[model samples]
Target: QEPGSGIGYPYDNNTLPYVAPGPTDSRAPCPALNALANHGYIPHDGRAISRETLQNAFLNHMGIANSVIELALTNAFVVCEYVTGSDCGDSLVNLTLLAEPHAFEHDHSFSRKDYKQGVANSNDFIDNRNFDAETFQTSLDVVAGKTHFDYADMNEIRLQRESLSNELDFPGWFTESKPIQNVESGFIFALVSDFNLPDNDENPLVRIDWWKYWFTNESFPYHLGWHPPSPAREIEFVTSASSAVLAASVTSTPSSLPSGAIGPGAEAVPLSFASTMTPFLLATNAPYYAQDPTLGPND
Candidate 1:
């Protein structure tokens, strides 16, 4: 049988039996993807996923629009094929491959440590794959004493995570693609807003407890009154949420660091040494620093 072929609409992913991934089961750095795996929306083992299956999974399970899914899959396949020479022509991709850094997976994730932090003391790369309680706790701390969190709160968490990434002086820090990062942060609130409080016409606020359940357990919060959006979340819905998140982040006050500490805006190390770094460091299709429109041939 074709993997992920059985997945279809009208399926209650929340009520589906939630099984924790066992040893040898592949998982991605994305909590949403992992949650989908746990609920069997995609492949239960999270391996050998086809583009078609993933597209359907996002549509039927998460209600994500095709355009957004295509955007995400494009980035994933480009980086995956470039780094690992995986043949996308085969029409299959390992979900674990999505964990490749600077691809869909990136530094300062809300639930996972940076690749550098995970590899600091151990040879096991799996450290980077599993959920980190401490990292998630830091995220939860941002919404402390509040039952629900809004765009501002979510943006603040993004800022805090970025600050932590800067503090670590993570290599290829400049390569932390902002476009994908912003969209990801937007999805955090977008999914919650759409699923947790579907009918609310005002600013959607995420229930902190439900957020915790999804992040920590990597499962949907159906038991807590969560349900998939009825009309399905479209590209406009996602883009609007992402734009609100970006706007809130831009206007929100940044977290103040200790005196003499380098923060997000500190001068970056020169990219002249790009040739010397690992191939994946330079693999981003458009690095954040490469977008300078004013550059001339002889600049």
Candidate 2:
């Protein structure tokens, strides 16, 4: 295996590893969303998800949690071929609303050396290792440049951007405001825009800030937060939908596992992830899956 590519982590015919959840994964391995990911369960980017459906997906997929689930659901989503620029991550809302606007006034340190601009800029944005833009408008106009600020007012921005996003491709100039179908409600669309044949040879992009205690592995780079550093190796994240850790009982197949056991494998999931998002599985039903103990009593 290459330095980055170590063991291939036990992957099945479908490519997803059987997951087991609960403390140390006590449950039997079940096929879940991880199953979908491993076996090539692709998504139809830009598919409009209603408020109701998105909410239920949270409860059904994730078990219990509040902040994490909220972020995961909001931050995690897919963009389709129609998106060229993004408004959800706009600064007009974030920097404008920040109590300290001047504090974030100038970050011109954006060195375009190692930085690889977004797909839209692929044609012109040279691979710059590190670069910063003086303004959001400049960032939007330049190749490889994109709005990197986090919207302090996400709901408001989302409400405003959806319509313009929907029409960018379907009808005309895409200047109006209307909700359109983009994965993750267009919260996280493809980083690179060209969505034609071979999808510009790109993966459906999603963004996240995965630098916390447990996930703060040194290997993760601090470049664009558009995609998971994509660790050299795809770490197998198995969690039981139910925890009943036991080896394959009567059956030796990958699906065979203990009952009452939540995860160790993602059996019921319809997505294509070889790992089970345990919290996602268990707290899938909690209101917004926010896991609020006092307000949301689902947990």
Candidate 3:
């Protein structure tokens, strides 16, 4: 048998039987990764996940191309090292460690509350790792009365979430300035539509039920005729679709602050340039920007 091929369907019978994560199981802020864990695509315990395991999980279960997997793994390793303060050269990462604030777990997530809104406000009793129905509903509301959502709908939802986050006074840790935030907004939508049906049409569409099931239950929509993409979503194809979705976005920050509150020449600092920086630079600089009260309008 091919290595790592026996882990998912057609090779293993235990791949189906969705199991809810127990109290001790580590979960992530990402619903897609959490769903994979729940369905045994990766480690059910969400601990010590190896690079090979993750690569295969996305490939076999989700039909994500190797190139995309490699790119994601590159980002994951940086995030893991920043959060754990240890070298990730061993190729093993704990999924929960990705939940570290300002690492990869940014504010205004689709199904998870911001760390400040949940843990900080609740005195640390509230865990931001698990799915939050209330937060999920906010996204659901974006597609109300619709059976399916497309790229335009997803873009709208992204803007709505950003607006809501601003309204909540959580202007977001990275906001629209970070590369991860920009890429993730597009990536999630791409995943929602099965990598935008890359081999077929340019229009990407996903059933509302499938979206709800994945986010709320943290499980695959197998019952909704959802199956892994056959040809495997290629990196160029997926990125092109995501880029189109991002291109359709209207660059506007919905804030209650007066015009120019972000300071003179702030809006002129091209975010495209910021997006080009390496993750190492981002990890080193984010905290300083996040904490420096004089730099932000909130102060």
**Maximum-TM-score candidate:** 1
Once superposed on the true structure, which residue ranges of model 2 sit more than 4 Å away at CA? 1-163, 166-299
Report the CA-based lDDT of candidate 1 relative to the real structure: 0.59
lDDT of 3 by residue, 1-299 (tens): 12233333452223544566666777776777877777667888878888888878877767676776566676677677665566788465667766666555665667766654622342332344567777778888888899777655665566666556545633333243223444555455445564335534466676678777667666665556565666666666556555555456444444543232221111111111133433322111110011111211101
Q: After superposition, how far is residue 18 of candidate 2 from its true place, in Å?
A: 14
- Which ten contiguous residues of candidate 2 have the minimum total lDDT? 281-290
**Residue-level error in angstroms, candidate 1, position 265:** 14
Whose lDDT is higher: candidate 1's or candidate 3's?
Answer: 1
Error of 2 at 37 (Å): 2.7
- Candidates in order have lDDT scores of 0.59, 0.20, 0.57
Q: What is the alpha-carbon lDDT for the whole of candidate 3?
A: 0.57
- In lDDT terms, which candidate is top? 1
Clashes of each: 0, 83, 0
lDDT for 116 (candidate 2): 18
Candidate closer to the true structure by lDDT (higher is better), 1 or 2:
1
Can you write out model 1's per-residue Cα lDDT over 239-282, one digit (the tens) per residue?
66656665664444445332322222221111121223443332
Structure candidate 3, residue pairs in collision: none
